[PDB]
Amino acid sequence: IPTNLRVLRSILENLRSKIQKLESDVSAQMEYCRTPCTVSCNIPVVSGKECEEIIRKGGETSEMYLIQPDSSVKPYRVYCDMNTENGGWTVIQNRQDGSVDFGRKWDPYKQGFGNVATNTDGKNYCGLPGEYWLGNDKISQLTRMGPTELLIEMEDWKGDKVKAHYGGFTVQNEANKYQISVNKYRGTAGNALMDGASQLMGENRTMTIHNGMFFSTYDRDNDGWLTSDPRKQCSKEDGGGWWYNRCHAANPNGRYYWGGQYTWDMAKHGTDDGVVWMNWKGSWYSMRKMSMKIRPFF
């Protein structure tokens, strides 16, 4: 009791002010949001069914393009990586800063969200990719037009990079809960989609396998967690949508924690949401960059 009141009183008074700071910080952002951010992306002439076709048509620079995978749907914007491994890659998911919120409900993950591309210092074309999820419906159709490979790239906060390649990748339509399938793995990042978390064994590992899983968001449970507990779900509020099992070995759509390592007292729900790829940086680490690209097989 002696020095006890001293301590507690010092903290409660301390926090009070951090609350005062935080409150201020939010007000400043509310004011900046009275207006939007903007881009001016003049559209390239060349176009195709998806990036690979474009690059075979002469589209050799990495920038935003318009593609019409099929005459039914209307042509839409996408970013094309024409430099990485012989180019022709259609980016369907990208993380590089914390610019976009990835903890969205089922619909935003169905339709898509984020910024496909941004302008590059005095330029009429958006040559840099933003952070975005192309959209489950679109991703579904793309991986179904024919054999599709998938390239996952990531980087830690120390500048290191590792890839995860998947010879075959498909995503069923909505009515089939966008079920995922992958195979022919090869890489350096570790096979977290098919095998599961490396630091695990038996059922503990096998239950962190994404391959074959259904897609779920914090407002639509399709995870491998069968029960009645209205809380034990894999995707909680602000949680990103992914192909959750019980619950994961990797999650490219997790919350973008700054710095890398994070812990249970920082996590909104104590769970380890965040740009994780266990097989590489471990359990409570969040990548600085994380992207997903597809391309016809051959």
Binding site: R16, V26, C33, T38
Partner: protein, 299 residues
Amino acid sequence: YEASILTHDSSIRYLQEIYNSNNQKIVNLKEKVAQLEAQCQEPCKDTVQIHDITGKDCQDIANKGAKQSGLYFIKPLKANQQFLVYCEIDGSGNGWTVFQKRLDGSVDFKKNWIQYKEGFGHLSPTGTTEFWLGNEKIHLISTQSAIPYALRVELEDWNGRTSTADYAMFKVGPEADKYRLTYAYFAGGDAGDAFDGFDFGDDPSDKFFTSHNGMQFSTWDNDNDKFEGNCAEQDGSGWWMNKCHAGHLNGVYYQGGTYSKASTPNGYDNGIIWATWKTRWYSMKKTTMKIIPFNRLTI
């Protein structure tokens, strides 16, 4: 310094007054945080948007109601799919479909067959970007079932003077005939008919070596000209080369407009030239090729 034990009962319940108060704020702050999040779910606003009105070409669209110039999706009758184009619309109700454009040299026009066939550059709603639509598209637009098309060609020196050259019955064949350019007659224009030929005095058949009517398109990786060598390769571009040109709008963009025989390691006249309006050594500052149904070119 260690006060009265009676000060305990007091301050020991005071920390509780600033504790629950803290939780209170935290509850409102979180509510405010939520509102912030709701304001941060949108994407940045893209200035460049595309109009919904579609149609066979910029004229069809114009007639359908299109009033302003910008990007549109057209789909000629025989095309397999729709493609984006820049439509120019005047207060008269005319829908020009632009396929060539120069204005700053920001785009390199030294491309190969495929690229010239598919198209390169960028399309801007404000029609302020250099591009080449693509021979296949240009072919499709100009050969729609029984619809005579016309070609207008506007130039602009680095001094504000702009000229034009109109061609009746413009047309471009399929890849099979190497996108051959053909027109019935030079519908006039102060730019002057450079597609008919131009005597430079160099040879006794300059007029024969620089005529473009009937010529097939050529690129460095696909020579279809009327010269022993490679026009497209020498001037480093893509065009309906003969042997080689009197009118060449896909030339190298020479800043300032005035270039010389000392601008290249061979002395080639590879700039944006149009012999009848300027010397073969005056590369234009702006260029623009557009087409529209002939039955629209002023009665």
